[PDB]
Amino acid sequence: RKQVSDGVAHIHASFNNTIVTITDRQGNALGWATAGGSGFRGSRKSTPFAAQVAAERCADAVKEYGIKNLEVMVKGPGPGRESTIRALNAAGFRITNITDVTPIPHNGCRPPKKRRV
Amino acid sequence: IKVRENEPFDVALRRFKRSCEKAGVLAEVRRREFYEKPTTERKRAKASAVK
Amino acid sequence: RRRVIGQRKILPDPKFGSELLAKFVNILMVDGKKSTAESIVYSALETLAQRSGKSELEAFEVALENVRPTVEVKSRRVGGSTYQVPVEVRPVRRNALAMRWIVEAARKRGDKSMALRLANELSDAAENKGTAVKKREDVHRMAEANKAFA
RNA sequence: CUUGAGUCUCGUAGAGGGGGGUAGAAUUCCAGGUGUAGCGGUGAAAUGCGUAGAGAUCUGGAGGAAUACCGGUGGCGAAGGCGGCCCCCUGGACGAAGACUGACGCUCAGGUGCGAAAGCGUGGGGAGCAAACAGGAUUAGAUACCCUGGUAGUCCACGCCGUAAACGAUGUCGACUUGGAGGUUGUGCCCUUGAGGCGUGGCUUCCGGAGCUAACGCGUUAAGUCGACCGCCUGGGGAGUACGGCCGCAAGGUUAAAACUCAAAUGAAUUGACGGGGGCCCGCACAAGCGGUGGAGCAUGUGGUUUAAUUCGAUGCAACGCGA
């Protein structure tokens, strides 16, 4: 029940998917939902006009609690890393600031040669 | 990448850090590195850059 | 593919003088037989004076109320396959759209006639039975409920 | 003897090489709070991971590889090379006044040495990519292309091999020969007041003059104009393969034929066509709409079919109610 008021959020946005996990100032989780975790799948999802109906899903599981204000992490680029933040503030939310927490090597490991389509 | 302000007015200014990284140093890392292609990308896609 | 004329003006109802309805009484007439239209629709509008008895003139525009779609599925080809980008429609087609399928579904019913196979689906259509509005919502369920690509 | 080679001096920039430190980011795997039905992924999907709690997410540890940004069209070295930072031991290259010896000189078959990657050794470590391998899907099909995993092996010394489109497919050393916008270094002088300003040496990038060039192009960094030396080349396939020597743990490397055999194999350059290459239009092309065919009878043309013959020609858009 605690009623936080100063907890955080984490928007992990891969290309073919994007999750919204609401956690607390420290780091402990709180509530969540996500793209494929809502009706549309395949690649019908990913588009921003899907990954904020998710956003407004976390709202109904993060209001059982008390959040008078929050901040956000955008670990991950892609199709739902702005639009996600849009149906945020509006659906009845404050916000100190935004902080980016996306990967950044100093050239440390090799990456997937992968897609050689 | 630090924002935050006073006077609640969901401003903007998240773009100020849009041009010191972002997908920028992600395209470089995304799939693979370059290896020899930089042997011909900074020293070859440079013919792109002479005027 | 490069001509922006406009729309071709059409002749009014033989009494009321209705251009907005002038184009309804055009998509009903088979093989240019405006001798079986000016007496099957201009008359199946006064037989709604039995489905209620009220003012049948504006007792048109409302049967086309729950029957006018406003966002549509306008395809495209970018990415690797298709694109649905549903988008809005303008009035130069709105009024007309419904008019059509409205008579269209009103054909493949099976009533006693067609002065009746039409005096029926222009009240029912106003009441949400028939394919009238079920089409409407057979569409909007896909359109504007698909603004992920739009 | 002194301008060529150089020695001292005295400056100077730099990822030059070897050894020893290291700090930060970053994945992954470990350990627990949270937290719930989800994450991962493709064109979509599947394989795999998640109610034995994925992923998200936090706080912690282990550990291996690599050093974003700076970074440059840059810098270095004799090539193959080489990128944070620190410390010791150590090359080379450049310049300025000078100071010095006095043709030492530039060429070199064989000779010796360095050797990207890959691989074989002994032994180490093994975080991430990943041949080989197994699922998964696509197809006719898939021993491949994308998906999920993963062994070697990328990494370490110690040693071998000693080949690559080993690149600029363009030896070396030396003086010439119109310039024009630069990059980086070094030293002279200009109210040095100055961003800068002007001469001048190494390196360098792009245009490009004559001229050379079979064309494309090289052009002060020459593919110009000459001078010393060494390397190789003589038509294609057969063939850098076979045969002998050599080296090599081997895999193989290199020294290198013959026999048949074809009128050609080539280089650049134009001409069009064709691109599942781009850029820009045009048509009922398409999209938007109205009608109809296939399907049902019947008329009819055709190829089948059978005929004693079913009279010849038309055979995609161009033939089929076509010449009948």
Ligand SMILES: [Mg+2]
């Ligand atoms: Mg050099």
Ligand SMILES: [Mg+2]
């Ligand atoms: Mg190796």
Ligand SMILES: [Mg+2]
């Ligand atoms: Mg694979």
Ligand SMILES: [Mg+2]
């Ligand atoms: Mg030139």
Ligand SMILES: [Mg+2]
């Ligand atoms: Mg040749």
Ligand SMILES: [Mg+2]
């Ligand atoms: Mg026409």
Ligand SMILES: [Mg+2]
């Ligand atoms: Mg059409």
Ligand SMILES: [Mg+2]
């Ligand atoms: Mg039709």
Ligand SMILES: [Mg+2]
């Ligand atoms: Mg013939």
